[PDB]
Each structure stands twice: as structure tokens, then as C-alpha cells.
């Protein structure tokens, strides 16, 4: 019995714009994870979204603000011509053409709508607790529909008082499309949305360690920013994952310095690129200290320097071995089936 | 054929508190207007609500911010522990116990949720255009579910582009609570919140000049304002006659020769003109918004030029031309529960499926 799934993406931005964060990696990988087992998976996402191979349906409208831009007492916002609202209205309309509906939005409304749907609606939470309304909505969903919530990390699960009631699936990626290369060259990678404050700001600043360039990937937003330390910093634009990975794989190490998934680490490993992260949040469950990467104290600009000088120690083939050992699609396949299948009956 | 209805109140505040606004009068009245015609009506409302003779279930939560205090580009807010969201969740729980659910809340969420219900949801919009997100929600609802949206006035409909596709049910009240009084005292009425920038100094000035003392009705939050009113006018000029209730209002109001109605906002539908007619009171109102379709000019009242003393003074000196018996007959004819019942049935019975 092959089942039919509908994935409703994040409303902060179009899939494959770079603006939807880590959902743009996880959504297609978890989709591919089920299609490989003979399931049908169809995606619904904001207008402007791109997705190879997969039945996609898009809807135009106003993007949802970022959640890490609002307090804890701040309410859920539904602006005019909300894309989120129209995404869900749309899912509701076709609910009977599907066996289950998985939501990837870190948003109140999808959770709230769960009992209003006849088709079972499972939810994959992507961030820690940020809002009171959001935690209350996840909790209400659990209470009525147990097992229907999931998470990637336990450090994510632990920010919730209902934390132990959420499943863990962790995170995967399509290993086949990442080429592991030994050829390293003194470069250094960094991969994300190049925001006003993501880790430049203040992680390039620790690229001085051996005056190393820091080749920067990521979708460039429309506004400007720019020059401190006079311009040894090799740049890149957005580009597909396959162009990313060739350009990335040939780094000596990848840096991560977010404020606190973050399933970028996991891409670097798939190329045998050792990760230097802050010993904080997600990275701790991905990186194995002084083996696949370094996990240093946050906010030093000194610890990182040292970490970057110790890269040659780490076996690059080991990084690639971990990535395969844990983070395959085939394993994430089973874990999704041991999450969703039971909800088709309960 | 009788049916079962579920009425879901406003999330701005409890019923029986003053915070729910005109829903505090509309909801019971429309409810009563169906029960006195065979139907059953239940009510869902926020924690604290007081509502007699009618099955009431109350719901805990944060109240919803009044829509008029937000601008047009502002989003819809759903706060943590929202009474609004919990109301509509509870309604959906019991949806199969009723033939139709009628929403009284001026908010995005109940409108968005209409296709998500198997039981028909009808919406009584209570204010004029305020937001982009609310206007589009009603618009969407109109398209998919024509005949689903009702309004109190054409003046309020006129604020929306799609106003022509809304139904005007007007308004009603329980006439038996209001005593017709054909012989009033030499006094004038004014009803509403006692604060600055609310129309009262206009009504005091025009009353005094006319040679009649004014009697007032409503909430006084700032005593310094009241003493300041006495300072610059007269101790005789204006007289507190209590808060509003409804039985105290119809007692005290019927005794006046006229209601001076001098509001600022571009409506004030505003129940009070209807209630004044119920006691056989002629209304002297500003010629704008709701009263333009309430008062028949020169027969049940006078519609006058806004913010102008001479215009009130002239209307006051023509109150005696107006038959108080007529004021009552138009309240009986246009604003009765009996009359609202057919309109509600004209509107809601076609919306029933099965
Ligand atoms: C990966 C993560 O889900 C993504 O970066 C974000 N998603 C969301 C967000 N904010 C909201 N309101 N909703 C989301 O789904 N901010 C960031
Ligand atoms: C009758 C009048 O419309 C009522 O007092 C109000 N209701 C509401 C309001 N604001 C919102 N958001 N919702 C309501 O139902 N402001 C005033």
C-alpha cells in the first residue's frame, strides 16, 4: 500500500530562493525519501517556488514575517493576502486527494487548523520555542493528536516543556548528489542567508587566523551591506546544490556561527569538509568533537582562530563516512514511515 | 419548520459588561427574535458573560483588540490564549448540533474558517471598512457563499466596495421593555460616554440657549471633566441621571421632549436613536451615517447640519411639530423583534442546506 502525501512548505519565502532557510533542503529530501519507497508526494508552496521532479502547486501572496523578529508575547500575524492562509485554504480544498498532510511551517494557523481537516495533518517543527502562542498551539495539537509533532534535534525538543512528547527524525540529505573530494586548498567555506546578523558579523574577523579568504555561498538579498577589512574575501552567488558542493568541497573547513537547523553542517560533511561550529544548539548532535569538526565556545573570536589551525588533523574521509553512516535518505525513509504511517489509523 | 442556531459573540469583551458594545444589545435581541418564532438559539461568549433566558457557554481567554484602533494595512492578530480562536474551535466541536452558526465578531478568523465548517456559518458584520485583511476576507466569503453577509445599515455597506452584495437587516429591540410616554417634561436628552471630544458641549450649549435643561446618560470616567463642564456652563444646564442599563434608560428618556444626538465618528447607528423612538422621543441628530436611515425628516425627528449650534436650536424649537405617537409607531414597524424575525429568516433560511 503506497500512500499519497501533500507537503505544505514554509510561507516566509519561495522554495529555492534561499529565503526559506533550511526548509528548502529538508522538504525535498524528506519528499525524496518517501518517493524512493513508492509513495506519491506533492508539494504546495508560495508563488515563485521551484522544485525538480515533484508535482508542485504554487499560490501567490504576502510572505509571513520571520519568527526570530518577534518577542514571546507577540501574537500570530496574518497579513492581507497572506500566502500562508491561502496555502492552507488550498490544502483544505484538496484534502481528500491525499492520505496525510505534512506541514513544515513554523506558524500558528496550520496547527490551529489540524482538527478542522478530515485528512490527518502531521507537523514537522523546525525551530525551538520562540513564542507563547506557538508553543501553546503545538501543545494543543499533541494533546488531541499524540505523535503528530516531530523535530530534528533534542536541543530543539528541550526548549519545549512538552519536548519529550515530540518525535525525533533528525535530518537527512541526498548523499548521491554531493561529491567528496580530498583536494582541499586554503580557502574556508560559509553557507547561509547572508543577513545583517547571521555570522559575518562576526565570523569573518576570525578568517584572519591565517589571513584565509573565506569563500561565501548563499542567496544574496536585494539590499547592500559590505566592506570591512580591505577585500581578500572570495565571494559566490546562490547557484544549485551541485554547483555549491563542488565549490564547497574544495574548502579546508566550513564555519558556523549562528545566534541561539542549520542542516548546512550536514552538506559540508557530505563533501568531507570539517565543520567548525559554536558548541551550542544543533551542531552538537551532528559534529563529533575533534573527529568530524570542532565545537568551540560561543562568541570568542579567538577560539575559532585556534579551531581553524587544527583542521589538517581531521580525516576528510571520516567526515564523509559519518554523513553516510547517519544522514542518508534511506534511513530517514524508515523514520518518516515510523512517524506518519501510524497516524493514518489513530 | 423550526431550527437550531448557534450565536457566537464578540471576543472584545464579556456580555453584560459594557465592553461588547452594541453586540450586548444586538445578540440578545436577534436571539430573542428567533426564539419567539419557534427556533432554539444557544450562545458561545467569553468568560464573564451574563445573558439570561438563553443557553450560554462561556470560554476563557485573552480578548481581541478592537478593530477600529488598528490601521488598514495592519495584519490580523491572534494573541496567545485567544478567546476568539477558542470560541471557533469550540463551535466546530458542536457544529452538528445546529443547522446554522451565526458569527457576531468583526474579525478575520471566523470568515476564513467558513469553508472549514460543514454547518453553514452566517456573518453579521457590525462596523464599516477598517482593514485590507478584513475587507478581502468578507469579499472572499461573498464570492463563495453569496447571501452569507449581513449589515445593519446601507451607510455602513457604502464603506465597502462589495456593500451592494451585503443584506441590510437593520436593527431591532425588545419593545416591551420601553414605555411610550406621550407627555414629556420640559427637558432634552443626550446619551453616551461623558468625556471630552464626544459631542456633549454642543448639546449643552444648544439646550441652554433653547431654554431647556439637558439630561445625560452614560459612563463618567473623569470627574474633573464634569466639574469643568459646570464651571463654563451652569449647574442647572446638564444633569446626570445614572448610567445606561436598559430599564433605567427607557424610564428616564421618555420624559424628555427630544434626544440631542451629537456624535463625532461618522456613524453612531446607534441603537440610541431607535431606543429614543421606542419611548416616543423625537431625535435631533447630525445628518450623517446611521440616523439618515433611522429618522424620517420632519416626522420622527430632525437631521441637522453637523457641528452647528443654530441648526440644533432651530430643530429644538420645532420638536412640538412632531407626533410622539408616530415615533413609537415607526419603532414598532421597522425596529421590532417581530420585524427582525422575518428579515433573519429571509436571510438565514436560504443558507440552510440538507
Ligand atoms: C528553517 C526555518 O523554518 C525557516 O528559517 C523559518 N521558518 C519560518 C519563520 N517564521 C515564520 N513565521 N514561519 C516559518 O515557518 N522564520 C524562519
Ligand atoms: C458592536 C461593535 O461592533 C462591537 O462593540 C465591536 N466588536 C468587535 C470589535 N473589534 C473586533 N476585533 N471584533 C469585534 O467583534 N470592535 C467593536
TrEMBL record, chain A:
Phylogenetic classification of the source organism: Bacteria, Bacillati, Cyanobacteriota, Cyanophyceae, Synechococcales
SUPFAM superfamilies hit by this protein: UDP-Glycosyltransferase/glycogen phosphorylase
An example molecular function term from Gene Ontology annotations: glycosyltransferase activity
Presence of the UniProt keyword Transferase in the record: yes
Record keywords: Transferase
Annotated coiled-coil segments of the chain: none
Pfam families reported in the protein's UniProt record: Glycos_transf_1
CDD domains associated with the record: GT4_AviGT4-like
Name of the featured protein: UDP-glucose:tetrahydrobiopterin glucosyltransferase
Residue span(s) of domain Glycosyl transferase family: 182-315
InterPro entries: Glyco_trans_1, Glycosyltransferase_grp1
Species of the source: Synechococcus elongatus (strain ATCC 33912 / PCC 7942 / FACHB-805)
Protein's UniProt keywords contain Transferase: yes
